[PDB]
Design a protein around this ligand. Sequence first.
Ligand SMILES: *[C@@H]1O[C@H](CO)[C@@H](O[C@@H]2O[C@H](CO)[C@@H](O[C@@H]3O[C@H](CO)[C@@H](O)[C@H](O)[C@@H]3O)[C@H](O)[C@H]2NC(C)=O)[C@H](O)[C@H]1NC(C)=O
Ligand SMILES: *[C@@H]1O[C@H](CO)[C@@H](O)[C@H](O)[C@H]1NC(C)=O
Ligand SMILES: *[C@@H]1O[C@H](CO)[C@@H](O)[C@H](O)[C@H]1NC(C)=O
Ligand SMILES: *[C@@H]1O[C@H](CO)[C@@H](O)[C@H](O)[C@H]1NC(C)=O
Ligand SMILES: *[C@@H]1O[C@H](CO)[C@@H](O)[C@H](O)[C@H]1NC(C)=O
Ligand SMILES: *[C@@H]1O[C@H](CO)[C@@H](O)[C@H](O)[C@H]1NC(C)=O
Ligand SMILES: *[C@@H]1O[C@H](CO)[C@@H](O)[C@H](O)[C@H]1NC(C)=O
Ligand SMILES: *[C@@H]1O[C@H](CO)[C@@H](O)[C@H](O)[C@H]1NC(C)=O
Ligand SMILES: *[C@@H]1O[C@H](CO)[C@@H](O)[C@H](O)[C@H]1NC(C)=O
Lengths: 688, 547
Amino acid sequence: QGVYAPAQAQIIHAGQACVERVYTIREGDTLVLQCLVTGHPRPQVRWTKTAGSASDKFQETSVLNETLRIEKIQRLQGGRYYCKAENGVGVPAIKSIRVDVQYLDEPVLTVHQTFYQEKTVFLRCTVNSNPPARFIWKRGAETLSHVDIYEPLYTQGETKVLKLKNLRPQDYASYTCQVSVRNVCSIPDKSITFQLTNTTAPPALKLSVNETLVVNPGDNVTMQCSLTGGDPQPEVLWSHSPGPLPPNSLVQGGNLTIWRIRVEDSGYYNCTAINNVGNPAKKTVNLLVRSMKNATFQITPDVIKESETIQLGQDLKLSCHVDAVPQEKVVYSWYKNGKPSDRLLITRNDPELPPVTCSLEIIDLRFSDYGTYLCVATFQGAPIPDLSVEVNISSETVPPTISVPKGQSTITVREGSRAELQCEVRGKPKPPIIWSRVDKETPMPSGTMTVETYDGKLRLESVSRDMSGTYKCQTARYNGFNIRPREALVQLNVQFPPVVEPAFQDVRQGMGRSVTLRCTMLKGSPMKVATSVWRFNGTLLAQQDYSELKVDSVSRETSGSYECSISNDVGVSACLFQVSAKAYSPEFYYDTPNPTLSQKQSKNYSYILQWTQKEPDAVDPILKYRLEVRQLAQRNTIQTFIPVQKMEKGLLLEHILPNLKVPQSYEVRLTPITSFGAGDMAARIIRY
Amino acid sequence: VDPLVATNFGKIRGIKKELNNEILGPVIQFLGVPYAAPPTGERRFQPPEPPSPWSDIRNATQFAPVCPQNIIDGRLPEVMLPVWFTNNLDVVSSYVQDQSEDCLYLNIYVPTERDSGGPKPVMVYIHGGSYMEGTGNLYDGSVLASYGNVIVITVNYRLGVLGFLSTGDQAAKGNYGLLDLIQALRWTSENIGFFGGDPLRITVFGSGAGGSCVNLLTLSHYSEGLFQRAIAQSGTALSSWAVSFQPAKYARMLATKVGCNVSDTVELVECLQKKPYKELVDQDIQPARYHIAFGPVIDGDVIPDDPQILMEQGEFLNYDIMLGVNQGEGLKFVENIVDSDDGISASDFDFAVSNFVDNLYGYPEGKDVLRETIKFMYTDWADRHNPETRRKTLLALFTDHQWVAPAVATADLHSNFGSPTYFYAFYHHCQTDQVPAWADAAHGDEVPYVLGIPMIGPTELFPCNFSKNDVMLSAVVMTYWTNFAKTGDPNQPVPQDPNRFEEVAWTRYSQKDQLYLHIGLKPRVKEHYRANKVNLWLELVPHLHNL
Ligand SMILES: *[C@@H]1O[C@H](CO)[C@@H](O[C@@H]2O[C@H](CO)[C@@H](O[C@@H]3O[C@H](CO)[C@@H](O)[C@H](O)[C@@H]3O)[C@H](O)[C@H]2NC(C)=O)[C@H](O)[C@H]1NC(C)=O
Ligand SMILES: *[C@@H]1O[C@H](CO)[C@@H](O)[C@H](O)[C@H]1NC(C)=O
Ligand SMILES: *[C@@H]1O[C@H](CO)[C@@H](O)[C@H](O)[C@H]1NC(C)=O
Ligand SMILES: *[C@@H]1O[C@H](CO)[C@@H](O)[C@H](O)[C@H]1NC(C)=O
Ligand SMILES: *[C@@H]1O[C@H](CO)[C@@H](O)[C@H](O)[C@H]1NC(C)=O
Ligand SMILES: *[C@@H]1O[C@H](CO)[C@@H](O)[C@H](O)[C@H]1NC(C)=O
Ligand SMILES: *[C@@H]1O[C@H](CO)[C@@H](O)[C@H](O)[C@H]1NC(C)=O
Ligand SMILES: *[C@@H]1O[C@H](CO)[C@@H](O)[C@H](O)[C@H]1NC(C)=O
Ligand SMILES: *[C@@H]1O[C@H](CO)[C@@H](O)[C@H](O)[C@H]1NC(C)=O
């Protein structure tokens, strides 16, 4: 390639700046970076940014523009930017620049008090700033070692501390930290002052409730957090964990009220006081709302005899459980066709089973034990309602077995629609089913690894292909037999339309020569070409995992747009080819001094129009170019023909436009002509 | 059979290779593949240009000439090179005896086969000892490729003067060797698909200065989209010998040596371009101790700024990263000061530190307190009189400073800025009769395991009598390395299948917990590798500089 030149970039500075490779500006101002580029064909330019995805100044910022513009810049918008410029010839051009937004926040001033001879106070001054700040202390007059000043570890220049080793009376004054950023980017210094007095003292709090507070749902609880010391007067603030305070909870300020408290409102409520003196005071109260949920039973046949079924002459455990907030306060009552138990039937409150689970055992099972057992969980004198779990034991009760009904082992559905997976469980009682995925360890529509279901149905509203795989269904260990869970698998096909290749392809070839088009299917379920249909300019044609078409003679009559419509049994997708013997667009040459002043008079200049032909040998040879010249101002165009002598990839072509009015601009449209006719036209604007 | 592949530059013929191992399948080798144009004539001290195409079938059955170098004990630095290299120069010499300035060639190893189907991952090995010598030809990727079912590529880039000379201005911007590596990666991205490789899963890895190269590439915008993951073994961009900070100084010393030292930097470079490459290579240019003369430079383009500044300010893309160090990197640092009793005297200890402080910490005021503080920290106060314990701690000092501290700094910053990071410590090796019996895993000792050398038994380059445990550990390392390449997770998709790594999942590294994998015959995950000594160099010592 003779004239084709690799891209070349250069960054230039604009907009508001201050004062080599870095572009420093004040926060809030406007950034303007321009990337000048050269090379042929004219390379494209995009400004991008390079930042750690997961921290601090990060934005995804890909703009296709020779000018980067950030108005009212911010701290985070800062960082390193690079301008990339490419044109196909050679290696892309890259230039780097660091934008260094600068600032100086208001300084924070805090103070801390502290053998037994001298009292010592530490005045700590902190500020966030770019560049690193400079600190100056003063007590009306500037202070030096004459007391001590220094920067501690675990600070990157953002902090200085003023140490008053011996607190003499003159020291009881107004201390002010004056922090400066060296006035770079014309940024003013800033100051903060504090009134150090012998009454100065950190905050202190008193709470109107105990360490831990238990309450019933609906109850109104109000908590008074009051100051008991602090100078300056500290600010009191309530907070909640987990999550925010509201709804139904209002902060008057100091006073915290919770109306109609719900069970989910339980947790820690912390009152904190701050006055920038010493450590902030904090009082913490843990509010526990009572509740009982998820009462469950378990049938545990003889474990030592290795049984999974109720058999006469065996031990039979009937457990009981409920989830409660004051878990230690629950009490269970076992009834059996009424409420009874010493001999043969015994109570056990805490086995290896879940926490706080009451379970009676029946030694030497007997037909007389066949009955309806009931467990009643309750709170000692609590207004909340009791909870119960009934569990009928009889000859009929039997461990469960699970299976897939008929042939729904593999069930296929189209993407988007709803899907329903099915397992059917048998036994008395029937435990709920727990669905999980096996092919991989991923979560589910519900967002967790498993879902509970009693009907043995798993419903999928908006089924996604991601869900396509293998699913496990198994019996619960609760609300039934506490036995090795029975398992069964089901396949889930999520069908979706095909995707073919290429989606679009601009095909060029001589007039007498032939060409073959292939449309290939990569993904698609079913992964089979149900049918492939080649179409030409709307009309259908005549006719394997893919489809092929051969254009015998690329002529004006056969040249056009071919469409291969590959389709599975669910949807259709098509490749689209553009066949022709059109020459490619000419490539305007932009890097030359063009205009020629006619004696600076007659209002005439001339322009040296230059360009190259992209891939001259891709089609029939270029005979002549049609040159059009319009002035923007008027519709009429001057049409001319440049005749090509011959050309090779990279040869520069030239043409002078003799009569052009000195101040106006012109549009230039340049079209190649081959035996096939007009190729792809290109356009450009020239100017004096 | 006859491996022929048509690339964008022409047809290429490969060569089938059987491995000396019944479980490993054979591989296809493409040796001496041009990935750039010869950097000769006006192309010397200039960026690489794409290679010229050919119309026939080009043979790739043998290694191409290596880049100009002089390792025949031509005053090379032993403290920077891997012990396996320096202890076997006669064999190493045979790999670089055939030289030419036209040396921009790469080698491709393709497996002949597993489980998941589709384009296979590509692992590009970047060699490097001191930037002055070496060749990818020394690293046979056959076993790694065959065992892991991945494509392995070794690259040859311009070395020393020819690859890194810089005048500090536009006359010679330097980093030519890095540009060749970038160009090699470009070639790979554009042509590896023809070999069955996945350009969307390219992992770059290297040991020593090769590891330094890997990290420097991750800080360059030129690497965008080129590769997705990086593995850096015993090498960072933050060490004292990773970058040449005074290129102009050394460029003029060379010029003076060859009669090219003129005022104009442009005329100086043109003068060098007229000189025979051998004349430039054979010159004696000694750099400051623990530093380099000719190597990567901060040009503001390839390398936008000091790696330290770029990393601290998170000015780098988020690649998947795996990095680590060996228990006893600095063997050669003390090996030369050890007495006939395998111990180090208190006076020798003081001397080493004194030399150490002066060379790395050239501060005029305060070097005294520094030397004394460093001695105290690296003194074992329990058994303080033992000359052998003194040897170990001194070795640790150099190891901690040159390898451990920089690696942790890199890992901390990468993870902190969102890059998935994995950290390891190599506490195993195979002792030859050429290394002291008291030595632990030294610099480069992990290479044979990563390359699967134990599986094909002792080689001319790696003569150690590998044990069954060496084979087992080698398999494990290769499993982890290729797993990272395949998914970005050392634990996926191949499980560790007695194998002591069966239940050992390699947790991701974070600055808060700093979990790392202890690689040895008793592997397991630990936390905060040498936290105390590492923090000394990274936090306290810098403070003693007086800001
Ligand atoms: C109602 O309460 C019962 C407990 O009585 C809950 O059943 C429990 O569910 C959890 C998770 O669903 C089970 O955790 C399991 O831990 C084992 C550890 O060996 C592990 O292998 C399992 O994969 C699972 O993570 C727990 O075992 C199970 N307890 C019993 C007794 O079955 C039930 O989920 C609660 N349901 C509702 C709606 O509140
Ligand atoms: C580039 O961006 C500037 C402002 O950011 C705008 O004025 C101009 O029209 C844009 N031009 C192009 C070619 O993107
Ligand atoms: C503190 O200063 C005040 C002056 O406002 C003085 O009255 C008082 O005695 C001093 N001592 C204490 C302990 O407050
Ligand atoms: C809670 O407050 C509401 C009004 O705020 C009142 O009507 C209700 O009786 C109160 N209930 C209790 C238990 O204090
Ligand atoms: C409240 O304090 C507890 C410990 O006392 C702590 O665990 C919790 O995070 C705190 N919550 C808030 C909002 O500060
Ligand atoms: C507490 O504040 C609530 C509103 O936040 C108010 O309704 C209630 O009367 C207050 N009670 C006390 C004792 O301060
Ligand atoms: C169990 O027996 C009780 C006894 O009254 C009956 O009400 C119930 O319907 C039976 N079936 C159950 C609990 O499933
Ligand atoms: C097909 O339609 C396009 C639409 O412009 C046209 O250019 C082409 O000539 C048509 N082909 C034939 C064979 O008429
Ligand atoms: C200037 O251009 C006009 C036509 O636009 C032409 O008639 C005239 O002769 C030209 N004069 C010169 C000096 O070129």
